[PDB]
Fold this protein.
Amino acid sequence: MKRTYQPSRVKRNRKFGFRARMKTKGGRLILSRRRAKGRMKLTVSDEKKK
Amino acid sequence: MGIKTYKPKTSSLRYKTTLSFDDLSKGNDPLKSLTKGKKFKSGRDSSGRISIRRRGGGHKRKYRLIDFNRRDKFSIPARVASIEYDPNRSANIALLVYKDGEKRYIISPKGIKVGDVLESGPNAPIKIGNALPLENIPIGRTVHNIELNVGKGGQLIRSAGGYAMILASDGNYVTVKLSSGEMRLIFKKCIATIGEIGNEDYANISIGKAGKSRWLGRRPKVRGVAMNPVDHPHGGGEGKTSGGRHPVSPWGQPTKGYKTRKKKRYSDKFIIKRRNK
RNA sequence: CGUGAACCUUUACUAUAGCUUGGUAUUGAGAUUUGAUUAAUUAAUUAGGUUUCUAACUUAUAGAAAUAUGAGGAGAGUGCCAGGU
RNA sequence: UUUCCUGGGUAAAGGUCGUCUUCCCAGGGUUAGUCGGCCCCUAAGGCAAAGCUGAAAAGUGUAGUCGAUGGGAAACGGGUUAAUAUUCCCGUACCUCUUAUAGUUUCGAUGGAGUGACGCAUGAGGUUAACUACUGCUAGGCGAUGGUUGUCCUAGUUUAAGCAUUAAGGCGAUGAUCUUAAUAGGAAAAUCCGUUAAGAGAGCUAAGAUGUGAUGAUGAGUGCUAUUUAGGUAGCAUGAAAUGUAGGUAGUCAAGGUGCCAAGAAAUAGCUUCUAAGGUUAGGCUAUAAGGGACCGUACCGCAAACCGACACAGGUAGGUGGGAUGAAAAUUCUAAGGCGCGCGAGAGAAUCCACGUUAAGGAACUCUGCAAAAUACGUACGUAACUUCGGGAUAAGUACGACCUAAGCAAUUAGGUAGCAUAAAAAUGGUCCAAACGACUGUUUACCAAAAACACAGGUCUCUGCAAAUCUGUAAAGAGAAGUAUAGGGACUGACACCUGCCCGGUGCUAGUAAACGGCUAAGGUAGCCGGGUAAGUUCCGACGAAUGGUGUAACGAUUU
RNA sequence: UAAUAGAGGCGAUACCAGGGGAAGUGAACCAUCUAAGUACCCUGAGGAAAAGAAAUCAAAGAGAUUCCCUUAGUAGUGGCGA
């Protein structure tokens, strides 16, 4: 059964990448929150996939 | 013009008719320097929502740059090169080749033929295809492609088989009977094209099957009584109701006779007698 | 069952989008008689009715803009107040 | 994302064991001018100075700039390593340019124009990889057991890009290259305006074929040393054994040709060409010689224990290769190359569960129900009703034949002989008819209990809207509608087609009227139409409410109901 | 276009100022009200901010602004219900 996570890469980087996060207000809030919490991974761009 | 019918070799062909394209200089590809490829619309707007429903994916078509505004080419005769099929509108398009070398498209009137010479301006003769300001066109003629504001182009009647009737002239204005049937005043300096628009069998066609309706880019229409009350004021069809309510649009606006034109519009001065039901 | 929750409907109640009417600001100058009121038909104001000219204002073309030309018009549009839906 | 290769090891983990593993540890492994990106271009789309619109945050949106699954310069064969190759090597091509030399002349822009540039259906025709039909030709065998040194058997007989030669076919003489006069083009032009007076002009495109590439490489085999399960296998040498005919698939010619309407991307790239400001070896073109290749990906899995399903999971998983025999075919079955023998097994077979095979007599008597099974099935012929919109119904129904050998015959098939219980001998490959209900029919939906009578639908009717339209989303701007224009757009209703669709304006909607409005039938009381048979035995079935939330019929159709 | 000068963002899941501003509740319902300028959003800077030297308080004779103790659960307000 084709299911929930057909894994593209251009979709991954475009929709959830660091530049897509910085591109708007809420994404920058996301980045600040994750920095404050001290996450080891900020965005999907830490998975080097292009 | 003409209608071509089909023998019923399938249950869908029994009532399919199409036009016959004999009055068309066939075998034609559009002029490469006047047509550009384009998307198909499907009725979504800049925000991305659907603003007009029930419009979908038809046949891919190019856009032909028409010219409803022949004003900047007054006094310059041109030649009719060909009569071509246009997918973006009902009527056919004529390709005029001007004496200075520029080529343009116009709406093809009824009864012109290849090789004719067409002229635009106050001095042009009264001949089918010529464009003249309403000043110069005599009372009692039939025109089309009427301009509404000087320099705007033909914004009035344009569809296949239509024409407008000049009734009277007075002051700055000319009374014109439009195809809907109302009598409207037009400023006398706007231009118009003489004669009816050809291709008058366009609407005598019986489409024949749901597939062709899909080709024409028309998605299916879902009635209101087939809905649920969350979806449409008419919903609730537990055994085929009729709405249980005076008929309304999907947004609550009444639909059987309700008049939606604004009650104090700016153009009310220029409408003599509205159309008839 | 709980003075539970949510949804839906209606000629249940109460608000309100939107629509619509009036007044006013935007909003000027003319002509005319419909009047009311105040005194002596006359005179001073004022609501209107029928019309006019464009400079406010807004439609078309050219232009980045400015600006120009061709048409509408103190209307319309937009605020505020009030009356309906 | 190291799972790849080599070596070592078995805490765990592998549904068991384990010397093994995609497990663990160490080491090693991915070489590019020709591949895929990067790059120069644009589709949808995103951002977007200015302008405009909004408490803010922003929303719209022009000039522009980004955005491939698209369009654009260049390479093929063979070999080598424990693992990597159109990347290294051997042999052999091609495209870009930096400088210089020598035949030299109009170069120069984000600007203008052309090319770039396109659909579907569908024959037929020209050659062809692979493959078999036959023969030569090489290599081996010449067969524990009847015959088999010859119409014997087995295997092979291979080889590209590029260059050179030519040219099936298509488009062409209705004009395809060009040579000048005029220039309403917006930068102005010796190009494009392809618009017009001439009158000189048939070529363009193109698979394929041959040679070269190539006495090269490859090569079934044969030859030495080691190994050995006595079977072949590790290095290592050597070897055209036809670049034969016939048939011809899949491309390809072909973005072709012929027809149809639903009339079938853009490019500021590339190619070609044009002129301004500026230049007159400053450049450019035609050649030669020399060297300049960016940056990144490059292993392996990739129909699976390496991707996505919590798993080493009966799932999903793009595209190009698709052998041979049978056959019309990629069906069915068998089989070559190649890849595997499902990661708990072994004894006994009790009942029973589940999935199947066979059957005396009867043949739906079982059961809510011919549910499920059984059976029918192909090819070639004969023969096909009622009804009907004349298209269909229809493969209606029903009937005959099919092996082998010989002969006839282009072949289907015919005739004779012969064999069997069976002779479309395996498998695959429709059960049909009659009557009724509803729906016209293809189709679509309840992902995960409803595939239907529901929706969709062609058609018809009513109503709204004159274009800075109505309408829809927004406080707005703005956009959609629409680069559209009443033969149009939006909404409601009905639902192919045929006959009909009547009465009522009180009430409620809409602008006294309007019912193809909500609705009713005193405002007006509804117009048309809508026991018999079957069975021995039949609560089933068949025959004797209500008119555009539609009434009554109807050919054809249906994984529908009876 | 040129010239310098001051800003962009982060940090404090703290504080302050300005703008926007709910809903769960209580009133044993709810619509007034309450919760509440609460949460949160957005725009600003500072080390504090804001405010700050009376056209004021208020019937006492005081004298800028802000923060405490009292006045005081008082004066009033509230479908005079909470």
Summary: Residues 8 and 34 of chain A are 25 Å apart (CA to CA).
